[PDB]
Design a protein around this ligand. Structure first.
Ligand SMILES: CCCCCCCCCCCCCCC(=O)OC[C@H](COP(=O)(O)OCCN)OC(=O)CCCCCCCCCCCCCC
Ligand SMILES: CCCCCCCCCCCCCCC(=O)OC[C@H](COP(=O)(O)OCCN)OC(=O)CCCCCCCCCCCCCC
Ligand SMILES: CCCCCCCCCCCCCCC(=O)OC[C@H](COP(=O)(O)OCCN)OC(=O)CCCCCCCCCCCCCC
Ligand SMILES: CCCCCCCCCCCCCCC(=O)OC[C@H](COP(=O)(O)OCCN)OC(=O)CCCCCCCCCCCCCC
Ligand SMILES: CC(C)CCC[C@@H](C)[C@H]1CC[C@H]2[C@@H]3CC=C4C[C@@H](OC(=O)CCC(=O)O)CC[C@]4(C)[C@H]3CC[C@]12C
Ligand SMILES: CC(C)CCC[C@@H](C)[C@H]1CC[C@H]2[C@@H]3CC=C4C[C@@H](OC(=O)CCC(=O)O)CC[C@]4(C)[C@H]3CC[C@]12C
Ligand SMILES: CC(C)CCC[C@@H](C)[C@H]1CC[C@H]2[C@@H]3CC=C4C[C@@H](OC(=O)CCC(=O)O)CC[C@]4(C)[C@H]3CC[C@]12C
Ligand SMILES: CC(C)CCC[C@@H](C)[C@H]1CC[C@H]2[C@@H]3CC=C4C[C@@H](OC(=O)CCC(=O)O)CC[C@]4(C)[C@H]3CC[C@]12C
Ligand SMILES: CCCCCCCCCCCCCCCCCCOC[C@@H](O)COP(=O)(O)OCC[N+](C)(C)C
Ligand SMILES: *[C@@H]1O[C@H](CO)[C@@H](O)[C@H](O)[C@H]1NC(C)=O
Ligand SMILES: *[C@@H]1O[C@H](CO)[C@@H](O)[C@H](O)[C@H]1NC(C)=O
Ligand SMILES: [Ca+2]
Length: 1055
């Protein structure tokens, strides 16, 4: 019965059987219960539920009245309620949802998966301090957002009520709305605010009605069908949660810039730095620590010959492109015969040298054998076997022992990855079925839907990658209820929590006479500081450069003259230093260090700039190239600052241990790049027009007077293919590229939605394998840092007792906790009765703090009281509260000498009372301290991060400073808020790129061609653009990775 294993096997078979019937659910067809197919599935489910009742009875009879035994009881109890309730028509379909819990029974039946889930549950309790820090972020930023932006995103530009009445015409739509509709709302700034968008910015007609929408006031709805707004604490948290995931966080920022003020970017930069970066990556650090506490053939020349032969063949497959000349097609097949024959000869010699059994004694010889016969099989049989010619690159692991030793190490990582993958697949399956029950057949259809198991799993998988997950959220909220956000919050939270534990699991198994004067000047203590000032001033000159400076303006004269002065100063600095040390004859000479070589090259480039500028000659092309190099002069700051020099050299040394993983990742990119060209070259064209459903070929597109155009990210050649793979790896806009590959039909054929669903294997396989390499690169850097780190008064006394006793602290805690509750009750258009109730509460809390300060004064004495910082903090809030109450009362009276701005700020500043809880949070203070001790390392990396932005911010203005956007030449990523028109706007844009929010959209806008009519084009910008974004993304991520490692190491040694 119970003391034998086969009874558990039978239980596992029935549990697996339920997984099949749950996946067979059809949300559109089964909910009506009409089909015979349905009738037998409910019959199967009743059969399965009957067994589960029998199992529970037997195990009950055997044992008498363990989390996992409770769990089976909960599932049986809930199932019986649903099973027996059949008969009452009220909410029966909603109660059917409890069935999605049943696959959880597999956890306890599978031993290895049972142990893993035990470790997760034992590690969760300790995350209380991280959770406490999370509440502080959501409450502080939640209340601040509501008091600032409540009801503003309902603003629209309306017609004047007097205008519509006196003119006796009502055919006009009441408020301005774009031709697209309410999905693109024109949010306007009210007269009592200073937002970026006014009703005077409405375009004219394209018979002048648009100019009569001249009053800005509240409408009925907020953006995205009411999903995005700050009308209450509830909607504020949904907006904050989306920002913390760094998905569509700029669209939220643009709304409040249009409606309220430009300087709202401060709110989102602080929320992203504190909330997204530190508060999420402290979750990893905490788990990381806790989980740790818990005669011719054998010749060298012959081997080298075959080595280069394989390499040349592998690379020749990369010269394919869309419109090949047929003589190039024939050349590649001639080249195939030569190399195929060469490997065939190689096998023949080795078979004669060792005999067949001797040849089979080596596995790599067996592998090479299978490829040769498959290659010969293709030639004799003259598109299937062509793809398998990519396997020839695998022969190089024989001749690369260094890479061979890395591959086996990665393989040894995958024996524990398997355990986590099983738990994730069960995790994804449960949410995939849940989504079908909640949202099935209700997103009427969108590609991102839960109408079937295949696209339910893909949608759930997509949400975990956090790509357009906000688009699915708005569908869920609008279709069912605003409380549908908890589905996505739980999915992302638990999904990422489980993924951190995989990263930690790998880490822990990883740990297991004039010359005399010059020499004196160069050795002066103040030489570096004196030169650092000129470098700083030169940076200011670069920041002021922008395209809109008129050539004849005084600013141009100031900037041009400054260039000559700085050029002379740094020529003199170099000269004096070269005289002191010598150029390259001495051992201390100038060019004996790379930091001196860099300065030399910059000075040379500067001199060439003077020479070219002196030319009245056909040197326009060369001039623009030198302008780009002038943006690299700020790099001289690194060598003058010892702090930056150490960090910069540290990052370079950190690439050594992960050198082989990068090479394997690069080889993977090319193998998939070549494969993508073979699959999709020439098929990413499409017809662009208003009525296109009737078009099916290029010829019909031409006939319809439309235009035949190509996607920006495509696979027409290996150069285009690599750019597409990078966008997939970064997982920004990767879903759109996947649709193009799923809809590909052929050359000169219109793509058809979901034409080839089997192409999901190509795109999903690349994301998974690439993520596995990037996961092992982060581990490699951590393991290296760890290995190197470990190698390196009768009436007064009674009051004093009360103040000394803990009773006062608990009373203080209760009052502020109640205050936080009253601060969350504010909301747009709240009733006047609530206004009176809240202001009365403010009276009570202020009096309590005033007494709290008095008693503390009486107990401890003035100066001894004031010594403690916490006591100083109390006095500030008490003082802060008094001025806020005073301003409020006087303004509410008849006199009005105060600005409504000062009242707003004082009202917002009362959120500072939350800091009085921080004293009780001893655990959280220790966690925050862990970051405070890591500033000397994290601080220097921050300087490098800002220096990275400065060079690319200045470079961006030079490259993309003149790119326009218009209805004639539309742009997908750039807008009125994201531009490189000046250094200030370029800095803000790079922060968006750094977070990765739709950075791929900005690159598109630079890949699109120049107009035939317009001037100032750079015909080779589409070639420079990928290099700019690719290098920035990699360097930016690498720098931020080391910041996490710096904090991670300190916590381990500190603990
Ligand atoms: C740290 C705190 C938790 C952080 C978690 C972040 C994610 C929060 C998402 C959950 C909030 C979802 C509710 C949003 C909300 O209140 O607005 C929707 C709802 C209106 O729904 P209708 O579709 O019926 O609208 C039509 C109106 N006729 O608004 C309300 O009805 C207000 C009631 C709730 C007040 C706000 C407090 C909600 C409590 C949230 C707690 C979530 C905790 C999750 C850990
Ligand atoms: C482990 C993850 C847990 C997440 C599970 C919960 C999240 C999903 C929420 C889905 C339930 C929302 C309501 C479903 C529904 O359809 O209800 C009917 C009604 C209107 O929706 P119509 O699709 O019919 O609209 C089109 C017209 N036919 O929705 C509601 O108004 C729901 C009322 C509120 C339900 C939730 C209240 C919970 C509040 C407290 C939570 C704490
Ligand atoms: C100083 C010089 C530094 C040069 C860069 C060294 C190599 C790149 C470091 C690898 C790394 O950790 O960054 C990978 C990066 C971050 O991974 P996510 O998926 O978390 O990114 C999304 C976070 N917003 O990955 C990417 O951004 C995607 C690009 C491809 C990564 C693989 C690199 C292949 C080798 C080239
Ligand atoms: C990697 C090394 C080489 C092996 C890759 C095998 C790819 C298979 C190619 C065969 C093929 O042409 O079909 C692929 C198939 C598309 O279906 P149709 O051919 O019926 O399309 C009609 C053509 N007009 O889609 C796939 O399954 C290919 C996905 C790529 C495989 C990735 C797995 C590698 C690990
Ligand atoms: C060492 C560095 C970091 C010093 C600080 C950087 C500044 C030099 C940056 C930051 C703010 C920038 C300014 C932000 C806004 C403007 C207004 C704008 O001026 C105009 O000509 C108005 C635009 C229009 O005509 O519509 C563009 C240049 C300027 C002065 C920017 C020039 C570059 C500035 C001064
Ligand atoms: C070789 C590997 C190890 C490194 C990666 C370098 C790539 C960026 C190189 C390798 C082969 C190159 C390609 C070889 C041949 C062509 C065809 C050539 O075709 C055309 O002139 C287009 C004509 C048309 O189709 O209208 C355009 C450049 C391109 C794609 C090259 C772009 C740059 C590529 C992809
Ligand atoms: C290995 C990973 C990290 C990505 C590598 C970076 C790529 C995004 C870059 C490297 C070189 C770039 C290429 C350099 C030169 C060109 C010019 C131009 O190439 C062509 O001649 C093809 C255009 C055509 O079809 O005619 C268009 C883009 C392309 C291939 C670039 C596409 C983007 C590439 C492949
Ligand atoms: C302190 C944290 C844990 C939240 C729990 C405290 C509650 C007592 C507060 C939090 C936010 C408050 C809500 C904020 C705003 C609103 C919306 C208001 O009007 C609506 O229902 C809006 C309709 C819409 O959804 O558009 C009714 C009061 C209510 C629910 C408030 C009632 C009291 C709530 C639920
Ligand atoms: C740490 C990461 C911080 C980097 C992110 C940005 C840092 C602060 C710089 C970002 C703040 O500076 C940008 C402004 O200088 C832009 O000036 P504009 O003249 O363009 O004014 C805006 C447009 N209107 C309002 C005139 C129409
Ligand atoms: C323009 O707007 C103002 C303010 O709402 C209004 O008084 C005026 O009548 C409007 N003018 C026209 C021509 O609609
Ligand atoms: C599509 O085009 C065909 C001719 O090619 C025409 O007969 C048909 O009416 C069109 N269908 C629609 C509705 O556009
Ligand atoms: Ca994105």
């Amino acid at each position: 019965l119970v003391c034998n294993p086969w009874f558990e096997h039978v239980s596992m078979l029935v549990i697996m059987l339920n997984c099949v019937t749950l996946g067979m659910f059809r949300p559109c067809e089964d909910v009506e219960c009409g089909s015979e197919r349905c009738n037998i599935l409910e019959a199967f489910d009743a059969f399965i539920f009957a067994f589960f009742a029998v199992e529970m009875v037997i195990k009950m009879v055997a044992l008498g009245l363990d989390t996992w035994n409770r769990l089976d009881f909960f599932i049986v109890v809930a199932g019986m309620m649903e099973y027996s309730l059949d008969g009452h028509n009220v909410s029966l379909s909603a109660i059917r949802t409890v069935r999605v819990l049943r696959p959880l029974r597999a956890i306890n039946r599978v031993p290895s998966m049972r142990i893993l889930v035990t470790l997760l549950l034992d590690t969760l309790p300790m995350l209380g301090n991280v959770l406490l820090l999370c509440f502080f972020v959501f409450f502080i930023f939640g209340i601040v957002g509501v008091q600032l932006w409540a009801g503003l995103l309902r603003n629209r530009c309306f017609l004047d009520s007097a205008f519509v009445r006196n003119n006796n015409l009502t055919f006009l739509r009441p408020y301005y709305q774009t031709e697209e509709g309410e999905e693109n709302p024109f949010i306007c700034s009210s007269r009592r605010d200073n937002g970026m968008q006014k009703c005077s910015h409405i375009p004219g007609r394209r018979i002048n009605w648009n100019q009569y929408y001249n009053v800005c006031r509240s409408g009925d709805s907020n953006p995205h069908n009411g999903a995005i707004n700050f009308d209450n604490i509830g909607y504020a948290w949904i907006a904050i949660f989306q920002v913390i995931t760094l998905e569509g966080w700029v669209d939220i920022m643009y709304y409040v810039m249009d409606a309220h003020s430009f300087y709202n970017f401060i709110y989102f930069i602080l929320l992203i730095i504190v909330g997204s970066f530190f508060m999420i990556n402290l979750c990893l650090v905490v788990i990381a620590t806790q989980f740790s506490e818990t005669r011719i053939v054998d010749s060298k020349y012959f081997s080298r010959g075959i080595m280069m032969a394989i390499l040349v063949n592998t690379l020749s497959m990369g010269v394919e492109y869309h419109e090949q000349p047929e003589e190039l097609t024939n050349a590649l097949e001639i080249s195939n015969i030569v190399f195929t024959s060469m490997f065939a000869l190689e096998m023949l010699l080795k078979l004669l040298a060792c005999g067949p059994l001797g040849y089979i004694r080596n596995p790599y010889n067996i592998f090479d054998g299978i490829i040769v016969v498959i290659s010969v099989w293709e030639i004799v049989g003259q598109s299937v076997l062509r793809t398998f010619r990519l396997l020839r690159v695998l022969k190089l692991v024989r001749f690369l022992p260094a890479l061979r030793r890395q591959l086996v190490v990665l393989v040894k990582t995958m024996d524990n990855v398997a355990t986590f993958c099983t738990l994730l697949m069960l995790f994804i399956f449960i949410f995939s079925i849940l989504g079908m029950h909640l949202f099935g057949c209700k997103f009427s259809p969108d590609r991102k839907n839960f109408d079937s198991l295949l696209w339910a799993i893909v949608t759930v998988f997509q949400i975990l990658t956090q790509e357009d997950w906000n688009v699915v959220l708005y569908n869920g909220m609008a279709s069912t209820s605003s409380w549908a956000a908890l589905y996505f919050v739980a999915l992302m939270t638990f999904g990422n929590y489980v993924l951190f534990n995989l990263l930690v699991a790998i880490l822990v198994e990883g740990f297991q006479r004039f010359r005399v004067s010059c020499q004196k000047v160069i050795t002066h203590k103040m030489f570096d500081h004196v030169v650092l000032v000129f470098i700083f001033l030169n940076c200011v000159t670069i920041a002021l450069e922008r395209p809109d400076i008129d050539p004849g303006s005084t600013e141009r004269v100031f900037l041009s003259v400054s260039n000559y002065i700085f050029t002379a100063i740094f020529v003199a600095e170099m000269m004096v230093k070269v005289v002191a040390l010598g150029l390259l004859s001495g051992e201390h000479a100038y060019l004996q260090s790379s930091w001196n070589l860099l300065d030399g090259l910059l000075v040379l480039v500067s001199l060439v700039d003077i020479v070219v500028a002196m030319a009245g000659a056909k040197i326009l092309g060369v001039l623009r190239v030198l302008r780009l190099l002038r943006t690299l002069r700020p790099l001289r700051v690194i060598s003058r600052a010892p702090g930056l020099k150490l960090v910069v050299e540290t990052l370079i040394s950190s690439l050594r241990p992960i050198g082989n993983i990068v090479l394997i990742c690069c080889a993977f990119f090319i193998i998939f790049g070549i494969l993508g060209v073979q699959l999709f070259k020439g098929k990413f064209y499409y017809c662009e027009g208003p009525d296109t459903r009737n078009i099916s070929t290029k010829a019909q597109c031409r006939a319809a007077h439309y235009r035949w155009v190509r996607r920006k990210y495509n696979f027409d050649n290996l150069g285009q293919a690599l750019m597409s793979l990078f966008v997939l790896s970064s997982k920004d806009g990767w879903v759109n590229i996947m649709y193009d590959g799923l809809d590909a039909v052929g050359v000169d054929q219109q793509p058809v939605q979901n034409h080839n669903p089997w192409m999901l294997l190509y795109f999903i396989s690349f994301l998974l394998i690439v993520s596995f390499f990037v996961l092992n690169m982060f581990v490699g850097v951590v393991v290296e840092n760890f290995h190197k780190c470990r190698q390196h008064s009768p009436t007064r006394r009674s009051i004093h007792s009360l103040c000394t006793s803990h009773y006062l602290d608990l009373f203080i805690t209760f009052i502020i906790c109640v205050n936080v509750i009253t601060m969350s009750m504010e909301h747009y258009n709240q009733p006047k009765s609530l206004d009176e109730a809240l202001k009365y509460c403010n009276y009570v809390f202020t009096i309590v703090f005033v007494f709290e300060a008095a008693l503390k004064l009486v107990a401890f004495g003035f100066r001894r009281f004031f010594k403690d910082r916490w006591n100083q903090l109390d006095l500030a809030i008490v003082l802060l509260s008094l001025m806020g109450i005073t301003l409020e009362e006087i303004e509410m009276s008849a006199a009005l000498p105060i600005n409504p701005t000062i009242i707003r700020i004082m009202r917002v500043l009362r959120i500072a009372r939350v800091l009085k809880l921080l004293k009780m949070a001893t655990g959280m203070r220790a966690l925050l301290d862990t970051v405070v001790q890591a500033l000397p390392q994290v601080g220097n990396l921050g300087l490098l991060f800002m220096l990275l932005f400065f060079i690319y911010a200045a470079l961006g203005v030079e490259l993309f400073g003149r790119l326009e956007c218009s209805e004639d030449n539309p742009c997908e990523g750039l807008s009125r808020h994201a531009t490189f028109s000046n250094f200030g706007m370029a800095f803000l844009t790079l922060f968006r790129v750094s977070t990765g929010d739709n950075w791929n959209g900005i690159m598109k806008d630079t890949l699109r061609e120049c107009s035939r009519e317009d001037k100032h084009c750079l015909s080779y910008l589409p070639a420079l653009s990928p290099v700019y974004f690719v290098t920035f993304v990699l360097v930016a991520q690498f720098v931020l990775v080391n910041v996490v490692v710096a904090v991670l190491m300190k916590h381990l040694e500190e603990s």
